[PDB]
Amino acid sequence: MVVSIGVFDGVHIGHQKVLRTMKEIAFFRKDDSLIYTISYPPEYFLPDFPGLLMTVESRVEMLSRYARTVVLDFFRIKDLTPEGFVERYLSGVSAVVVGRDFRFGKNASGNASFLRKKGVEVYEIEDVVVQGKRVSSSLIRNLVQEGRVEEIPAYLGRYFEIEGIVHKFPTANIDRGNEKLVDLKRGVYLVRVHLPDGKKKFGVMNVGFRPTDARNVKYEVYILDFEGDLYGQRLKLEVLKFMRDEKKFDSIEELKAAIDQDVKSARNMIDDIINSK
Ligand SMILES: Cc1cc2nc3[nH]c(=O)[nH]c(=O)c3nc2cc1C
Ligand SMILES: [Mg+2]
């Protein structure tokens, strides 16, 4: 099979390059296509990891739009020798498509080189470069932490997204799940809210330390022109623009005022977008 192998956290434009190339290679080699997505990169378990751009589930759903997608369980492959990885995951595979410096097996002893020696052809995909920077999940995770959401589409191929369930003064508190995900810079954001039933609304989302565990961040959105409790429902939010830093108000009024100011600003932004016919 022609098999793409990588993490693909975020499925950014560099990943899309790998996947499109795999499909073309599959077409001319007349082989089938398969994407192996490693559940977590090794850095994920280290203390300073910023967090994934999205859950593995969201990721697989996106990868699946390109080809059959199989998750490689980090815990199941980290200890394998290069030999055992090939024997167990690449039997009958004649070609793999991976990014440069791809590594595998315990102590990262496996590489494209080793694969070629086992008769596998390896197509190493060069990184995609955007405005002088190499597109990578790390770069995108850093933009999220710096709240630089308008610059994200040029690297990710779309706006950064926050996703989760509600709950678990009307705002929807988004539970993003139990996976370690990158957090947006604390503050207020203009968001496009994809509700269930296909409706799309705009929202003003606040991101703030709500300690209650420490690097614990809360995501609550005030959806514009929408009532009805989405409590228990799944939401997806495109993070469009950083509006203002988080603030420490001195009691239920200047907050209200600040919020009112956020919505007002949002309304103006939306109206600007609309007028850009
Ligand atoms: C819905 C909403 C809640 C907020 N909570 C907030 N809470 C807080 O302690 N500081 C803030 O700056 C803040 N901003 C908010 C902005 C919005 C739009
Ligand atoms: Mg061969």
Give the number of the ligand closest to the Cα of residue 119: 2
Question: Are 106 and 168 in the same domain?
Answer: no
Supply the CATH number for residue 114's domain.
3.40.50.620
3-state secondary structure of 238: strand
Q: Whose CA is nearest to atom 4 of ligand 1?
A: 206
Supply the CATH number for residue 255's domain.
2.40.30.30
Q: Whose CA is nearest to atom 1 of ligand 1?
A: 222
Last residue of a domain, one of 140, 159, 178: 159
Distance (Å, whole) CA 188 – CA 239: 10
188 lines ligand 1 (CB under 6 A): yes
Question: Are 127 and 261 in the same domain?
Answer: no
Q: Nearest-CA neighbor of 156 among 147, 166, 143?
A: 143
Question: Are 42 and 134 in the same domain?
Answer: yes
Question: Are 85 and 153 in the same domain?
Answer: yes
Question: Are 138 and 186 in the same domain?
Answer: no
- Whats the size of the chain, residue-wise? 277
Question: Are 90 and 167 in the same domain?
Answer: no
Question: Are 3 and 118 in the same domain?
Answer: yes
Distance of CA 67 to the CA centre of its chain: 18
* 262 labelled ligand-binding: no
Distance (Å, whole) CA 159 – CA 157: 7
CB 36 within 8 A of CB 1: no
Last residue of a domain, one of 159, 188, 203: 159
Distance (Å, whole) CA 143 – CA 136: 11
* 142 labelled ligand-binding: no
Question: CA dist 248 to 207, 208, 251, Å?
Answer: 13, 10, 9
Give the number of the ligand closest to the Cα of residue 188: 1
Give me the helices (H) in the chain, please.
13-29, 56-63, 74-77, 82-89, 112-117, 137-145, 153-156, 254-275
Question: Are 53 and 29 in the same domain?
Answer: yes
Distance (Å, whole) CA 241 – CA 131: 20
Residue by residue, DSSP assigns 64-87 as TTTS-EEEE-HHHHTT--HHHHHH
What tokens appear for 128 in the block?
A: 């995609």
Which residues have CB under 8 Å from 215's CB, separation 6+? 183
Distance (Å, whole) CA 169 – CA 255: 11
207 lines ligand 1 (CB under 6 A): no
Question: Are 55 and 110 in the same domain?
Answer: yes
Please give the span between the terminal C-alpha atoms of the chain, in angstroms, as a whole number. 46
190 lines ligand 1 (CB under 6 A): no
Experimental technique, in short, is X-ray
Atom of ligand 1 nearest to the CA of 246: 12
254 lines ligand 1 (CB under 6 A): no
220 lines ligand 1 (CB under 6 A): yes
What letters, b where the CB count within 10 A reaches 16 and e where it falls short, cover 50-62?
bbbbbbbebbbeb
Long-range contacts: 224-231, Cβ < 8 Å, 24+? 224/263, 224/266, 224/267, 224/270, 225/201, 226/193, 226/195, 226/199, 226/201, 227/170, 229/166, 230/166, 230/172, 230/195, 230/196, 231/166, 231/167
Q: Nearest-CA neighbor of 224 among 186, 257, 268?
A: 268
262 lines ligand 1 (CB under 6 A): yes
Last residue of a domain, one of 159, 184, 219: 159
* 165 labelled ligand-binding: no
Question: Are 122 and 20 in the same domain?
Answer: yes
Range of the domain at 4: 1-159
Q: The tokens 């199989």 sit on which residue?
A: 70
Looking at the 3D structure of the chain, how many domains does it have? 2
Cβ neighbourhood burial of 100 (10 Å; 0-12, 13-18, 19+)? exposed
Distance (Å, whole) CA 227 – CA 233: 14
Cα 83 to averaged position of ligand 1 atoms, centre (Å)? 53
Question: Are 70 and 133 in the same domain?
Answer: yes
Question: Are 116 and 132 in the same domain?
Answer: yes
* 100 labelled ligand-binding: yes
